[PDB]
Design a protein around this ligand. Sequence first.
Ligand SMILES: [Zn+2]
Ligand SMILES: [Zn+2]
Ligand SMILES: [Zn+2]
Ligand SMILES: [Zn+2]
Lengths: 80, 81
Amino acid sequence: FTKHICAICGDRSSGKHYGVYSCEGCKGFFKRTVRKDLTYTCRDNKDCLIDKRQRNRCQYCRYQKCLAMGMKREAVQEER
Amino acid sequence: TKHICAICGDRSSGKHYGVYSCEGCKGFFKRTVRKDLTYTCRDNKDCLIDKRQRNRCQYCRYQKCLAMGMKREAVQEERQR
DNA sequence: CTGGGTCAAAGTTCATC
DNA sequence: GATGAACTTTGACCCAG
Ligand SMILES: [Zn+2]
Ligand SMILES: [Zn+2]
Ligand SMILES: [Zn+2]
Ligand SMILES: [Zn+2]
């Protein structure tokens, strides 16, 4: 079931992931970012629009928005 | 399931934009859609699109991508380099 | 009331022309 | 700039009280 919306990009959501209502895309993205301790950089103004269509344009801005909406790095477990 | 590109007959590398196709036809469809490129056929819009002559008519290669089922809706926005 | 995993099919890269 | 073989990321769908 996906009755709520993603706080980061506005796509559909099953509910909270890492503390925030998010879609499978934003969940996966935050998980991988944290697991591999990735660092991104914005080529524009560090204010890129994050919606379903544009969410992959800028990883840096997608990641800042994950944090801004409440996703917590501590909620990502170690790899099994 | 097929290992032949439905557009040009070269070995396909998997399904791309809805059609079993090669990396060449995938790449060409992606670029055409992303950049809104329009081509013109020099002959009569019926050029042979095969592994060896696929680049000899962009108009006919693109029309064949569409005819074989490639979907423009499956090409996404360009990401940051 | 959300942790985990996969891998098809999206993506980009860059040597070669 | 265009191409295409090789390389990387995404996210829909599945697992589990
Ligand atoms: Zn999202
Ligand atoms: Zn940005
Ligand atoms: Zn082909
Ligand atoms: Zn032609």
